[PDB]
């Protein structure tokens, strides 16, 4: 999907910071409840790409995607986002 690099930036930042990400299966919604700026469609598609690349673990229940950051994801996101190796997601802390 065509997504601005800035929007992907915010999505990845939030995902790495929290360790998890939740999104309702609602393509039309223009505002994610937690991540600001980006739309539900962009959040869903970005994390679906992560899941396809096995960087995240996906679960679905009652019209709600839950996503868990994995170790492949923790490496990829840190290298992509250019953070120090000391920073770690809240879940690992």
């Amino acid at each position: 999907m065509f997504i601005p690099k800035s929007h992907t930036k915010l999505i990845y930042e939030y995902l790495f910071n929290e360790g998890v990400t939740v999104a309702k299966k609602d393509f039309n919604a223009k505002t994610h409840p937690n991540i600001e700026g980006v739309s539900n469609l962009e959040v869903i598609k970005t994390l679906k790409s992560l899941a396809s690349r096995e960087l995240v673990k996906e679960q679905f229940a009652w019209r709600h995607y839950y996503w868990y950051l994995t170790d492949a994801g923790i490496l990829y996101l840190r290298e992509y986002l250019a953070l120090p190796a000391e920073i770690v997601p809240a879940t690992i802390k």
């Binding site: 929290e18 360790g19 998890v20 990400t21 939740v22 409840p33 937690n34 679960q59 679905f60 229940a61 009652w62 709600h64 839950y66 868990y68 809240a90 879940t91 690992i92």
Partner: protein
């Protein structure tokens, strides 16, 4: 917030149902058994009854922390307001859901239907249940569907005592040919201490104080 008590009760029920479904879909491999919600106005405690708390918690309790974060974000709680606690179910053999998932795993692995069903039946019976019924239905042999029932002990069907003594669970298994339904019913034993079963005896079981 200002919400009628009727709507508060219904919201609590909806929350519990969704939480149960999500945990059932997630910790099925971890031997999930059930969930209890003590939604105190200050903090929402959620007890996850599973057979193996080790896997539920994960390495240094990371999986439970992830689940707490996900629940908070999904249900719009406040950071730290909702807390998850793992719990070890006492008798796995008397928990129908756990045995249903065990049968699911055996059938997925490829154990013969009869062998797996009889193994589960024997284990549940040795665990102390008065009776057990295991039904596996679907495309077990050939294109035509069939249902195979396994019964041992005694089992009640009609009346209120069912709600107290009978514990059921239903699951699906998707094999090459199609879906197969597993149903497990366990009649718990009469436990005066109220741990392995109901505290009150069957209404028709008159017990005599010997002189």
């Amino acid at each position: 917030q200002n919400v009628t008590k009727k709507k508060k009760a219904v919201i609590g029920g909806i929350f519990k149902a969704e939480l149960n479904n999500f945990l059932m879909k997630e910790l099925a491999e971890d031997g999930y058994s059930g969930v209890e919600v003590r939604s105190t106005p200050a903090r929402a405690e959620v007890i996850i009854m599973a057979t193996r708390t080790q896997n539920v918690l994960g390495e240094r309790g990371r999986r439970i922390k992830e689940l707490t974060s996900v629940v908070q974000k999904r249900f719009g709680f406040e950071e730290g307001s909702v807390e998850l606690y793992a719990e070890k179910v006492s008798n796995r053999g008397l928990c129908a859901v756990a045995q249903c998932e065990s049968l699911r795993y055996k059938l997925v692995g490829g154990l013969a239907v009869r062998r797996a069903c009889y193994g589960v039946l024997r284990f549940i019976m040795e665990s102390g249940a008065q009776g057990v019924e295991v039904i596996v239905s679907g495309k077990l042999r050939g294109q035509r569907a069939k249902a195979m029932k396994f019964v041992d002990g005694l089992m009640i069907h009609s009346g209120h005592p069912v709600n107290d003594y009978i514990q059921q669970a239903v699951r699906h298994v998707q094999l090459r040919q199609g879906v197969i339904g597993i149903k497990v019913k366990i009649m718990l034993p009469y436990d005066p201490r109220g741990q392995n079963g109901p505290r009150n005896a069957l209404p028709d079981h008159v017990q005599i104080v010997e002189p």
